[PDB]
Design a protein around this ligand. Structure first.
Ligand SMILES: [Lu+3]
Ligand SMILES: [Lu+3]
Length: 247
């Protein structure tokens, strides 16, 4: 998904920064410690209200770029009993009979995401992955969370079996389980401005209010989104009729 929202003061740590470190950068740039600083609709320290950044139209945004997916090796659980039934022959004559054996399996699709430094995005992230075995999976997800959705597969199989004279005979419904997954990542980028108000006129021309691009006052202006999309499903259903065993 293409996300673009305001950067907040409580997310400065996500850019390895702080209001104090931003203020100190403004101090270095202009040669006087500002009274206060401003970001979008917020201020910090001894600041002019309303924020000079909104007054003067200088905003600052965090962005999620294009999500890139990388397939992980698929893990296959090669045998799982979904159903098991035993036919008992208590007579002196064999009989043959057609039975139906039924199992159900609950498929899961799981999304998880995070950022390396703890950005606080509000807009849902769109995650879509087509899995070979599991098929198409999509999510609209809050970054930094986990979600699982479920779907039910019921499988019935008819089978004709002869059970000898004094014996029982077991029938199983079996499947393989595929855990399919892909890792994903997206660049986080910050662009726009911070504001500062000074106790005296500073800078070229002598002004009380100044704006500097985020890159001038923050220790970094990028980060990273990461996550995984998993699907667990059953496939390769088989009927197993085991040899008749004596009672
Ligand atoms: Lu194959
Ligand atoms: Lu196959």
């Amino acid at each position: 998904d293409v996300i673009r929202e305001y950067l907040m003061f409580n997310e400065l740590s996500a850019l390895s920064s702080s209001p104090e470190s931003v203020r100190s950068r403004f101090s270095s740039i202009y040669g006087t410690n500002p009274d206060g600083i401003a970001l979008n609709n917020e201020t910090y320290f001894n600041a002019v209200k309303p924020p000079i950044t909104a007054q003067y139209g200088y905003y600052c945004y965090k962005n999620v770029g294009t999500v890139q997916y990388v397939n992980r090796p698929t893990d296959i659980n090669p045998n799982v009993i979904l159903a098991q039934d035993t036919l008992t022959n208590n007579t002196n004559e064999p009989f043959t009979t057609t039975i139906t054996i039924t199992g159900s399996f609950t498929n899961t699709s799981t999304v998880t995401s995070s950022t390396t430094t703890g950005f606080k995005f509000t807009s849902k992230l769109s995650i879509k992955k087509v899995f070979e075995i599991g098929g198409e999976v999509s999510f609209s997800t809050t970054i930094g969370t986990s979600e699982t959705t479920t779907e039910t597969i019921t499988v019935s199989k008819s089978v004709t079996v002869t059970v000898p004279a004094q014996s029982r005979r077991t029938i199983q419904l079996t499947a393989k389980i595929a855990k399919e997954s892909a890792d994903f990542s997206a660049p986080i980028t910050v662009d726009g401005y911070f504001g500062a108000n000074f106790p005296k006129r500073v800078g070229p021309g002598g002004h009380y209010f100044w704006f500097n691009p985020a890159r001038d006052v923050l220790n970094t202006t990028s980060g990273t989104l990461r996550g995984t999309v998993t699907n667990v499903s059953s496939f390769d259903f088989q009927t197993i009729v085991q040899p008749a065993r004596s009672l």
